[PDB]
Structure formats: structure tokens, C-alpha cells
């Protein structure tokens, strides 16, 4: 029996959904003060080994906050809420393609300047490259990568050129929380 009224409203989560969440959020909460800290979330072992774990972690904290209210915890997970036919049949749900892309985009563009520099791409790359790759091959890839996606030649990737680069991508699905269903 939480504030899951206007919450189930902003995230479009089904009753039992927020329940499995609140329950899950309850488990993540250690000292139990109705909030989470990088501390609490970093306890998720699997996430730690996740090359994006830290960026995912930080995404749960706005501008400078250091704690996540339950509604904030869900505000994020809401982006990965599976899309229902009713969602597409009204305010834009946090799980729309546009918002899923924005979320992913915000993980590349750390300085939140609106564009993905060659460096911001290079950092993401060094995170996901099994075989030891020369810092040069990377610069080359990060380069080519931004190069290919860069349309207005400003050297960086705007959200639109980002969106554009994924038009043939099944983003909806590649970003929908399976388990929840």
C-alpha cells in the first residue's frame, strides 16, 4: 500500500508490477529510510560486472542527488516497461521509442551537452571490447562510428542523428524488460 497511485500513473506500470518492484526496492533498501544510495544499488553483484553498471546506477540520480525515492526508482525502470497496444492506441509514456532512445542517449553523453563526442563514444567502447584492442583501433572505431552516424558533420552525434542511426533497429524490444511479463 504505497503511493503507487500517481506512480502507476506516470509509469504505466500494472498493479502487480509495482508490487514486484516495491518488493524488489524494499530488498535493495538496507538501513530502510525509504531511499536507495549508489551504495545500495552497487550491492547488485551482477550489475557490478556489467560494463554499464555504473552508468546505469548513476542514471538513478538526477543532477546531483545521492538517494532514489521509490518513484524515482520506477521512473527509470519505466523506460524499459514492455510496450502495450494500449500505449500506442494521450501523454507520451516513458517507454516510448523516443524516451527509450533518450535514456540510452543520456548514457553515452555523460556531460549531458546534447551530443556524443568522439571521446564519449570512445569511453563506451573501451567498456565493451572483450579482445584486448589497441587504444588506436578504438579511436579508429569511435571515429568511424561517430563519422558514420554524424550527419551534420559537427563531429558529434545529436539525439536525432542518434535516433536516425537506429531507424532499422528494434529498439522497442531491445529495451523492454522481459522478466516483468
Amino acid at each position: 500500500i504505497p503511493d503507487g497511485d500517481s506512480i502507476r500513473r506516470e509509469t504505466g506500470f500494472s498493479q502487480a508490477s509495482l508490487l514486484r518492484l516495491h518488493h524488489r526496492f524494499r530488498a535493495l533498501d538496507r538501513n530502510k529510510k525509504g531511499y536507495l544510495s549508489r551504495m545500495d544499488l552497487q550491492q547488485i553483484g551482477a550489475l557490478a560486472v556489467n560494463p554499464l553498471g555504473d552508468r546505469i546506477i548513476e542514471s538513478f540520480f538526477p543532477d546531483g542527488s545521492q538517494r532514489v525515492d521509490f518513484p524515482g526508482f520506477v521512473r527509470v525502470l519505466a523506460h524499459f516497461r514492455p510496450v502495450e497496444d494500449e500505449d500506442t492506441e494521450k501523454p507520451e509514456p516513458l517507454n516510448s521509442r523516443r524516451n527509450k532512445l533518450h535514456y540510452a542517449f543520456q548514457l553515452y553523453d555523460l556531460d549531458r551537452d546534447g551530443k556524443i563526442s568522439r571521446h564519449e563514444m570512445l569511453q563506451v567502447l573501451r567498456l565493451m571490447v572483450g579482445v584486448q584492442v589497441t587504444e588506436e583501433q578504438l579511436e579508429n572505431i569511435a571515429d568511424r562510428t561517430v563519422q558514420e552516424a554524424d550527419e551534420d558533420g559537427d563531429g558529434a552525434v545529436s539525439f536525432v542523428e542518434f535516433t536516425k542511426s537506429l531507424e532499422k533497429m528494434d529498439v522497442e524490444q531491445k529495451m523492454s524488460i522481459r522478466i516483468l511479463k
Partner: peptide, 25 residues
């Protein structure tokens, strides 16, 4: 299968996983 598609694929993949792990199994 452009370079982007590949990078982003792995990215969204590592992303979803982390998220699902935040939700727990």
C-alpha cells in the same frame, strides 16, 4: 549492419541486462 547498429546493439543489450538485474530475477 552498420558499425553503429553493432555498437548500440551490444549497448542496449548490456543496458537491458543491468536493468533486469536491478529488478531482480
Amino acid at each position: 549492419r552498420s558499425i553503429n547498429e553493432e555498437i548500440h546493439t551490444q549497448f542496449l543489450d548490456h543496458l537491458l541486462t543491468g536493468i533486469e538485474d536491478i529488478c531482480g530475477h
